């Protein structure tokens with residue numbers, strides 16, 4: 162329950178990093194997942210929704226700089242941790258009912274393992290495309 | 294016709310070309326191409342290693358799951374001779 | 382001689398051995414350590430069928446992964462197929478990272494010295510970024526006026542074509558101007574002045590390059606008086 | 613002369629760790645790995661003369677494990693325990709010294725390179741393709 | 748250099764000081780550092796074993812490089828910008844059509 166709470170908080174969050182950027186064009190930045198919100202300026206708390214659009218030399222199918230972005234600005238590996246985590250929480254909740262088959266709670270912990278396996282990948286790709 | 298050859302003979306053209314192209318090396322690579330920085334390793338360099346690590350974890354776990362699947366429920370010493378003859 | 386602002390060099394701190402990686406890598410290797418060992422535990426103790434036959438547990442596995450990571454060997458090996466096929470991955474994982482570690486620590490333990498900018502005044506003739514001047518009513522300023530070496534000629538050209546005045550009125554004026562220009566205004570004076578300014582607090586100045594010529598201080602008398610030969 | 617834009621500095625990709633050694637050398641590594649493990653399997657389990665066959669513990673899969681263990685600097689628990697498999701194993705040890713010491717010479721230079729891409733040089737794709745204009 | 752040669756005359760008339768000292772060393776030579784034909788100096792450098800350098804023009808240099816036995820080598824860069832041309836007597840009618 163604590164892990165599910167902390168992971169859902171960390172997903173539902175605009176405060177992960179702090180850097181110097183802009184708020185809304187066309188500054189110490191209260192930056193998070195997609196809402197690159199900001200503070201300490203002309204206005205404080207206008208959360209621009211960000212995605213990918215560079216102005217490059219037209220990389221055509223540069224996969225390690227394109228598919229990486231596709232996994233970055235659509236969190237699938239971070240969001241799947243919540244899915245597996247509550248999926249295993251349902252099984253540890255369903256331990257009591259339908260019991261005395263000595264098999265079901267083995268299936269539960271696999272979700273808890275694999276969710277952290279998704280989490281570590283999400284952290285790696287987030288730091289990767291921050292410096293990307 | 295006689296003056297241009299004097300300039301070419303005395304290198305005045307070389308001096309002017311150096312003045313108006315090479316003494317104004319300003320932007321980037323001409324000045325900073327012969328310097329050195331040591332290192333600092335970032336995570337963007339080493340990412341596929343972690344990728345291989347996590348994928349191998351998943352593969353090994355899948356192997357054990359189908360092992361427990363099979364042992365919950367070569368062959369014919371004999372046809373091994375067939376197998377090795379067709380392999381040869 | 383040429384005097385500039387000394388760039389502030391960085392000192393190696395206490396934990397100056399964790400340098401050839403970054404802190405992201407240091408936390409990711411901890412995370413992966415935990416994950417690899419717990420996956421090895423999960424694959425080991427899984428009711429194979431008797432049960433206490435295999436030797437692995439959480440604790441054994443925790444220090445097995447560490448003894449595989451740092452090259453110190455082990456006491457036991459995985460014998461099950463999936464345990465071997467997960468241990469080989471960790472074996473491959475260490476051989477990249479610790480090799481990168483040693484090979485880059487070999488790079489950090491060779492050089493610590495700065496790259497030494499605009500030395501020997503030729504780039505002072507070449508670039509347009511950092512300005513420079515002399516003292517007005519000064520023999521050095523007159524020397525660059527009358528000088529005929531072409532690099533000195535171009536330096537005199539840049540000094541006479543100045544926006545604003547690169548020239549100053551007294552020595553301490555140019556001292557403070559270089560102390561506040563942050564590497565954007567060089568300064569020309571004489572070597573004794575230069576080393577005296579170097580040997581004072583706050584030591585924020587620095588002599589670069591070599592010398593340029595051979596001048597000399599003397600005693601000056603009016604022309605024709607009787608003091609000349611006894612002095 | 614042909615003027616085009618500046619390109620962007622292509623940082624090295626995912627499978628760049630195996631970069632300092634050429635693919636042919638990796639191929640010969642895999643072949644030698646298989647061959648050494650199989651020959652070491654052949655030396656044992658060769659009717660050793662009630663233990664007349666299980667004198668050693670080297671199965672084909674145990675030898676496959678031992679070779680890979682010896683290659684990457686962590687020796688396994690078992691040892692060849694008899695002659696003539698060991699003048700395989702010592703040669704394999706000499707091999708794994710000389711190879712990976714050559715591997716880890718300048719590895720850090722191979723993970724920060726950032727070379728350029730240069731699409732066209734002697735133009736002629738300005739004849740061939742229709743994409744990039746020129747005037 | 749080559750005798751009766753434009754390069755030898757160029758080092759005679761040259762006024763850059765490094766070229767002046769080179770001309771000084773060439774005119775103060777024991778024995779003659781000068782040669783009469785091109786292949787003479789080629790063989791002299793092929794037998795001097797790195798004790799006698801040679802000056803010629805870049806096209807000659809790359810042609811000697813692209814032949815057997817390839818024992819020669821061009822070093823450094825160039826020095827100036829000369830040019831081959833067609834030569835006519837002064838005032839004839841062939842000048843402008845050529």
Ligand SMILES: C[N+](C)(C)CCCCCNC[C@]12C[C@H]3C[C@H](C[C@H](C3)C1)C2
Nearest residue numbers: 452453454455685686687688712713716
């Ligand atoms: C497992 N055990 C206890 C049976 C053997 C001891 C481990 C061997 C430790 N050597 C690690 C290496 C050191 C240098 C020279 C080579 C290549 C690398 C640099 C890594 C080997």
Ligand SMILES: N[C@@H](CCC(=O)O)C(=O)O
Nearest residue numbers: 516518519520521522571
């Ligand atoms: N000794 C010199 C100092 C100033 C300078 O070098 O220009 C003078 O009195 O002129």
Ligand SMILES: N[C@@H](CCC(=O)O)C(=O)O
Nearest residue numbers: 749751752753754755804
């Ligand atoms: N083209 C030159 C060759 C000899 C030299 O360079 O001195 C000439 O005819 O004089």
